[PDB]
Ligand binder design. Sequence first.
Ligand code: DTP
Ligand code: CA
Ligand code: CA
Ligand code: CA
Ligand code: CA
Length: 903
Amino acid sequence: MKEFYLTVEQIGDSIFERYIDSNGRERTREVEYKPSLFAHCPESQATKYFDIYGKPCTRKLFANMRDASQWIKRMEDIGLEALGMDDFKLAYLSDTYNYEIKYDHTKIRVANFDIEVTSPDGFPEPSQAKHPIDAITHYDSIDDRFYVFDLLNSPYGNVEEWSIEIAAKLQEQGGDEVPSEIIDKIIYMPFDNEKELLMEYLNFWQQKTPVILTGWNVESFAIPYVYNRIKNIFGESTAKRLSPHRKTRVKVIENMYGSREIITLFGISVLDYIDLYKKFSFTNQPSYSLDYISEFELNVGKLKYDGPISKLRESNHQRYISYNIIAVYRVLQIDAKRQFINLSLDMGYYAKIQIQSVFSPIKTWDAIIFNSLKEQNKVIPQGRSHPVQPYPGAFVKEPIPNRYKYVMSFDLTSLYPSIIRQVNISPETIAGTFKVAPLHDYINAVAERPSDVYSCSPNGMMYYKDRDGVVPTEITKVFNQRKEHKGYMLAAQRNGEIIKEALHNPNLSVDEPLDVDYRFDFSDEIKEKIKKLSAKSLNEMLFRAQRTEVAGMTAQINRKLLINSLAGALGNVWFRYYDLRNATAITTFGQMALQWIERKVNEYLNEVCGTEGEAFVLYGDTDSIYVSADKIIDKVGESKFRDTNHWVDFLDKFARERMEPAIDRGFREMCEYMNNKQHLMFMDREAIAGPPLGSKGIGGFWTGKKRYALNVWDMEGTRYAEPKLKIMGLETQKSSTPKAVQKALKECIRRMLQEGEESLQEYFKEFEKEFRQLNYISIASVSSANNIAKYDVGGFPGPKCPFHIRGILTYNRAIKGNIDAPQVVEGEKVYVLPLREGNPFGDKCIAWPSGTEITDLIKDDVLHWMDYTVLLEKTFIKPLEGFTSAAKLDYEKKASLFDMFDF
DNA sequence: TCAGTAAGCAGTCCGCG
DNA sequence: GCGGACTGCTTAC
Ligand SMILES: Nc1ncnc2c1ncn2[C@H]1C[C@H](O)[C@@H](COP(=O)(O)OP(=O)(O)OP(=O)(O)O)O1
Ligand SMILES: [Ca+2]
Ligand SMILES: [Ca+2]
Ligand SMILES: [Ca+2]
Ligand SMILES: [Ca+2]
C-alpha cells in the first residue's frame, strides 16, 4: 500500500499527522517540520528556484515554523515580498506525499453521530450546556455498527431500558420500525448516570477516533454541546480528549449581521452533513430539518411522536431512543445516495489539503496550483491585500415576451474554463495590453485585429502563446475528470428512459433485475432482456439507474462547480492569484462570444431561409442561445410528420448536420480574430422543444430575462419517454413559493405548453374553487429571515420593515412569555401567511419556523384568520397573469357571440 | 448564512397635480 | 395604482 494522510495540524513548532502507513494501519506522528520560504535574489546568484515570472529566488530554510512566520512579518516591515507557501501544513503534505495520492476509504474512520438533550426551558444552547446529554448514537464506518449510549436516570426523569424487539416492530404493532437491515448492527449501552455515560463515550472515542466526523448540525450543535457539557462536568482537559492531539479552539464564525462559535477539534475533519448538502446538492429548500430533507431525498415518512420534544423522553423513552438511531441512519442513507463524503475525499486528496477545506475553492485551488508549480521548482507569490471592487459579468439578451412554438437551444461546454484554456489566461502568461475598441465593434468584426503575436480578450489583455499557463494546465485536468463523470451521468439517464419505455409493456412473470453497469449505454442484448422483464424487476432497475445518475451528477456538477469557482476566485481579493485583468478577460470574452455567435446563427439561418434581418435567436444568457425553429418546421410542413418523435428527429438532424458545423465555423473565425492559443468554443445542441404534434399546446414562452418555460422532448441526446417541462426562473422554481402553488402553477404551465388555452382555463377555474381546502403549510410562503433585531422596535415593526420580518414580530408578540414555544432563529427560514383585517394578532401577517407545524398555542386562531383571498391573488393569480399575458392567452374565458343561443 | 456577476419579483415609502 | 429608489431575497448563469 502507498501511504496516505488522514489529518494534519500545525501546533506551535510541530506538525501533527494522522496517516495510514504502508501496511494499512492508522498511525500518528509529531514532526518538527522545517519550512522553506523564498526571497528574490540577483541573477548572478546560481539557483534552481524561480518565481512564476521567471525571476531567480533563494530558498530560506528555517529552524522552525515560528521562525518562518516571524520572517514573513519582518519582510512586510521592510517592504519586500516573502514568497512560498505560508500555510506550512500544506507544504508538509506536499513534501511528504510527492505523488498522486491513492486513498482507500475502507481505512478511513468515518463517524456520524447525533445527540439528544431534554430541555424544559427552550432550546438547549451549546455555549451553556446546562442540561444532561441523555442519548448518543454514534455510527462507525469501520466497525459498521451503531453505538447507542442511553441515559436511564436524569433530573428530568428516570426511564426503563430501550427494547430492540419493540424497536424492530411495525409502527402498526406499536413499534418504532427501526429498519431491519440495521437491527443486527446496533450495540446498545444503557447508563445509570450521565458522568458514567460521558466517561465511557470518551474512552470509546479514544479507541475509535473519528477521522471524518459528520451528522446533521454537528458543527453548530452536537460537537459544541458535547464539548461544553464535558467541560462543565469534568473540566477542560477532559473535554479536550475529543481531539486526538488534546488541542481545541473556540472559533468565531463571523457573518454580516452577527456571529456564532464552533469548536475546532485539532486532528479531526468535521464535515457537517447539513453544510455538505447546502453547498453540493444544488437545491434550495424551504427547510433543512433532517425530517424535511429525508422526505425529499429518500421519500421516507416523517418521524411522528405525540407532544413536545422536551416531554418525549419522559412519555416515550422507547421511541425517543429509536428516533435518535433512525436520525443517524437517515444521514447515512442520504450519503449513500448523494455521495458527498466520497466527493470531499476525492477533491481533498487531489488538492492535498485538509479534507474540511473542500468547502473553500480558494484554499483548494491555492494547493492545486502550489503543488503544480512546486513540481517545476517554481515559487508562488505572496498573498497581497486588495480593496474590493465591482467588475462586469455575463451578457443576457432581452427577449421579446411571447409564446414560441418550436425552439432549439445551443450551449457552450464549460464556458469560463474553456475561455481560460482558449485564451491562455493565467497570472504568469500576461504579455501586455492592446487598445480596446467598443465591444460591439469586436462582435461585428469591424475593429482591427488586437494582435498578430499574442492571444487576446476584448477587454484589452494579451497572453503568451508559447506555453500553457499553470491555471489553464490545472483547470484542464479537473475539466477532464468532470467530462468523464458527466458521460456516466448521461448514459444512466439514457438507460433510465429505456427502462421507462419498457415499463409501458411489463411482462406477467416472476424474475430478477439484470446485473448491469448503468454508467454505460445498454447493449442490444440488455435491451432485448429488458423487454421481457416484469414491472417489479424493471422498477428496481429504474431505481438503480436513477441512483447511478445521481452519483454521476454529484461527481460532475461539483467538479464543474470547482472549475467555475477558479474563474470566480480571480475576482476574490483573498485569492493568491486575484487579478481583475484576468477575471474581466474571461467575462468580457464571454460577452463577445455569445453576441458573436448570435450574429453568426442569425446570418446562417437568414441565408438558408432566403430572408434578411430576421431574428432567429430569441434569447441567450451567458453562453447559451435559443433559436426559433418555426420556419424550419414550416419548410417541410407539419402535415408531413408521422408523429412528435418524427419532427424531433428532423430537428436533431438539422442541428447536428447543418447548424453545429455553421456554429463551429463562426467560432473558429472568432478564435483567429482574437489570435487565441486553441479553439475550444464548443457549442452543442441542448434542448429540442415544441408542442405535441396535432395539439393546441403553445410549446414554450418567455416573460423576460431568466424567465421562461419549454416543453422539451430531447435534452443533450436524452430522448424522453414523456415530454419534460424545462422551467427557469418562474415561481414554480422558487423555494419562496408555496408548495401547493408551485404544483398548481406547474400544471397551468404544462396545460399551456402541451394542451392549450381551453385546458388552462378549465384547470384555473377548478383550482380557484378548491384551494381553500389546501393544508395551511402547503399554501404558506417561505422566506429567509435576516436582521430581525434591526427592525424590532419594542416588539413592533420599525421603518421599512420587510413583510416576512413583520410576520416574525407578530409571532413573537403572540408567543410572549412562553419559553417552551419554538423560537424563530436569525438567518433561518420561516413560513409566512397573510391575516385578515381585525384579527387578534394585531397585524397583516404571521411567520413561524419553516418545516414545522405552528405551535398549538396559536394554531387555531391562525387557521381561522388566514387570508385565503390575499394568498391566492399574490402567490397564484399574479404570477399566472404574468405567464398568460406573455404567452398571449387568457386564463379566464372571454365572452363571445355564441353566448347568445340555446341554453 | 464562513467557505464570481446579472437580474428577476415582493414589498416599503412616497411621489405623481 | 403605478413607478422609481431602495432593501431583501432568490434565482440563472
Ligand atoms: N455557480 C457558479 N459559480 C460561478 N460561475 C458560474 C456558476 N454557474 C455558472 N457560472 C458561469 C461560469 C460558466 O462557465 C458559465 C455558464 O454556465 P453554465 O452553462 O451553467 O455551465 P458551464 O458552461 O460552465 O458548463 P456546462 O458544460 O454544464 O454547460 O457561467
Ligand atoms: Ca448500515
Ligand atoms: Ca454551458
Ligand atoms: Ca415487455
Ligand atoms: Ca448555459
